[PDB]
């Protein structure tokens, strides 16, 4: 997911800009987004949410709007227990488990159910699970006592002012997410949100592992309030962003550093090439229009090619294998964009899989490591070009096996296919540097591949009066069998042909294709 908010000073017209841009599976049912518009005499909200949620997480209206990205807020702890004498060792003494006898019914092949017993054991930490390898593990989830998650979002997204918004956010009922805000008054905010346990010692990595479950030393009981969390409001840079990077470059110039916060809140890992582009795309541009802001969202640069091909190509041309040489020249001639017509992109991806791992996040291949002091221009270069050429050799073989050639058009292998709609793909893997994301599957036997994950709900809103917004849903507004509203948007996605989002009554009326009168009595 990506998120941008831009202050009026950075825009041509003097109205804030907002990008909602979640990336989630195209298939996982609970991750499916739905777009809707709710209007009462007292509120109005437009946008997307995960199915079965009664409030819109990606909302805007005439006054304000928000968007979300995963921050990985560590709101739980897993403890390795030391079992002894039917209990567990804790602060030098054996402590008995809490235990209840539950049960559940399990549907059989023949449509009957059997009652199955389920013992639930707990330690002071929480419920205890046995791992396949035998490890006794207790899980302690923070914020089990915040019943107000949905109402907070509701009050956040219907806030009448930023203060009201902040007041609602401060309730600490939403246990996770980066959350970005903008409004017609001109305020933009970024918050690193969640329910984080207050701990005395340990960095984020310590708290993500199996914490020892034999001492009250580690059994936290309190959580941080909002103003302990990384936050940014109207920074001198005139924008905020997050693209799943640690919260250390949410704007430029930054307004804080890791030292300003407890070390268990966020990682201090190299920022992804996508995140680096996010910062660049906002910082380097000024006097933004909504049109330009939309054009910038479509960025699909192979930033990793920029960091590696200058060292890779010359090393590759040295190789005696003519096919390696040809591969080098193919890569050399490429404009370094994930476009449909690119003959080099697939080959480059296959090399990068070996150079930077299957996820493309590996760092051990670079010559200059990433540094928070050069957060949009590191890591850089190829550390061992001879090894990297051998990786190209293998990659050439892999590309031909997967795709039939080393120079098959990117958009010919990369298709978006829903129902009977089959259109060319552009853009690609976030970790290669592509801001607009389509996480292509492995190819079928024909070398054809489709997005497992990526662009889903995409909207860009200008907080002018009236507001002006555009969006698309990759996989349509419905998934019910036989719906005409599953594949009716993917063709527009292939051309980046965005729907104007319709908030005004007059607009809704002009566009209506079906009316469902209803009436509710409790």
């Amino acid at each position: 997911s990506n998120s941008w908010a831009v202050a009026p000073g950075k825009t041509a017209n003097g109205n804030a800009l907002l990008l909602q841009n979640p990336h989630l599976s195209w298939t996982t049912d609970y991750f499916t987004y739905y777009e809707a518009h709710l209007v009462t005499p007292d509120f109005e909200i437009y946008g997307a949410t995960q199915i079965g949620l009664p409030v819109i997480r990606f909302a805007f209206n005439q006054r304000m709007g928000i968007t979300n990205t995963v921050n990985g807020m560590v709101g739980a702890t897993n403890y390795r227990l030391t079992l002894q004498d039917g209990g567990y060792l804790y602060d030098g003494q054996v402590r008995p488990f809490e235990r209840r006898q539950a049960s559940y019914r399990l549907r059989q092949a023949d449509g009957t159910t059997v009652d199955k017993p389920l013992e639930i054991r707990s330690s002071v930490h929480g419920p205890v699970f046995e791992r396949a390898d035998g490890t006794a593990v207790a899980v302690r989830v923070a914020g089990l006592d915040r019943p107000g998650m949905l109402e907070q979002y509701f009050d956040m997204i219907t806030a009448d002012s930023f203060d009201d918004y902040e007041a609602a956010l401060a309730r600490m009922q939403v246990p996770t997410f980066n959350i970005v805000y903008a409004d017609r008054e001109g305020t933009i905010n970024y918050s690193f949100n969640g329910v984080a346990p207050k701990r005395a010692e340990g960095d984020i990595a310590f708290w993500q592992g199996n914490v020892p479950g034999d001492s009250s030393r580690y059994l936290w009981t309190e959580t941080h309030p909002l103003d302990d969390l990384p936050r940014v409001t109207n920074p001198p840079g005139g924008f905020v962003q997050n693209s799943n990077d640690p919260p250390w470059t949410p704007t430029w110039p930054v307004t804080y550093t890791p030292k300003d916060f407890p070390s268990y809140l966020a990682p201090q890992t190299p920022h992804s090439l996508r995140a680096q582009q996010s910062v660049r795309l906002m910082s380097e541009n000024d006097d933004l229009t909504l049109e330009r802001f939309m054009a910038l969202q479509l960025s699909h640069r192979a930033v990793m090619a920029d960091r590696t091909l200058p060292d890779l190509i010359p090393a590759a041309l040295i190789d005696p294998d003519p096919e390696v040489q040809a591969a080098a020249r193919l890569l050399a001639a490429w404009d370094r964009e994930f476009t449909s017509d690119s003959r080099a992109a697939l080959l480059f991806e296959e090399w990068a899989r070996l150079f930077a791992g299957q996820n493309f996040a590996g760092q051990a291949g670079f010559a200059t490591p990433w540094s928070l002091d050069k957060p949009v221009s590191t890591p850089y270069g190829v550390r061992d070009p001879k090894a990297a050429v051998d990786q190209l050799r293998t990659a050439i073989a892999n590309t031909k096996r997967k795709y039939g050639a080393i120079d098959r058009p990117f958009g010919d292998a990369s298709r978006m296919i829903l129902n009977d709609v089959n259109v060319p793909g552009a853009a690609g893997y976030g970790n290669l540097g592509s801001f607009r994301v389509f996480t292509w599957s492995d190819p079928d036997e024909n070398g054809v591949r489709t997005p497992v994950h990526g662009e889903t709900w995409v909207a860009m809103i200008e907080f002018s009066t009236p507001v002006r917004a555009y969006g698309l849903m990759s996989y349509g507004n419905s998934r019910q069998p036989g719906t005409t509203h599953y594949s009716d948007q993917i063709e527009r996605v292939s051309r980046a042909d965005f729907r104007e989002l319709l908030l005004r009554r007059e607009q809704v009326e002009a566009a209506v294709q079906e009316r469902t009168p209803f009436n509710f009595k409790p």
């Binding site: 609970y30 209007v39 549907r107 419920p127 998650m149 949905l150 009236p466 998934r479 009716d488």
Partner: protein, 154 residues
């Protein structure tokens, strides 16, 4: 400078657009929430019902072995019961919004039984607490504490 004049609905209606996007107009909050429930049920009812079923801890019971481990995960973590608690702990006004949302789903399903897959029919009716129970699974027991990190499967 003030925003454009807000719209005051005089009737409860969903105006759907050419892309199947519901514009839900309610005369008050529970009405809009009911409309929203109706719409979500129309566009996504089958999978919504399946998910609510799971968050009741009834996955294994409704749907057999493929749903058993998520059932064990959620019962062990007392999710369905906690959702009843959180539902009782809602503010009166918001709890009324939730009941309305749930009522929308039930009403769509009752008015359009052909649209509801045989396998998820047994989940109906759904409650305000179902709606809270699913959100509770999603935030705390998929996003925050996934079964994989605890069980060490990833």
């Amino acid at each position: 400078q003030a925003p454009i004049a807000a719209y005051k609905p005089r009737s409860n209606e969903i105006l759907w657009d050419g892309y199947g996007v519901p514009h839900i107009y309610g005369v008050d909050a529970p009405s809009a929430f009911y409309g929203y429930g109706w719409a979500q049920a129309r566009s996504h009812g089958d999978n919504i019902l399946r998910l609510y079923g799971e968050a009741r801890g009834k996955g294994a019971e409704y749907w057999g072995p493929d749903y058993e481990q998520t059932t064990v995960w959620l019962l062990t973590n007392g999710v369905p019961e906690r959702a009843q608690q959180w539902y009782a702990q809602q503010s009166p006004d918001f709890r009324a919004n939730l009941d309305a949302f749930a009522a929308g789903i039930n009403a769509y399903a009752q008015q359009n039984p052909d649209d509801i897959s045989p396998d998820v029919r047994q989940v109906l009716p759904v409650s305000g607490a179902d709606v809270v129970a699913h959100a509770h699974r999603l935030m705390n027991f998929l996003y925050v504490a996934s079964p994989g990190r605890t069980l060490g499967e990833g």
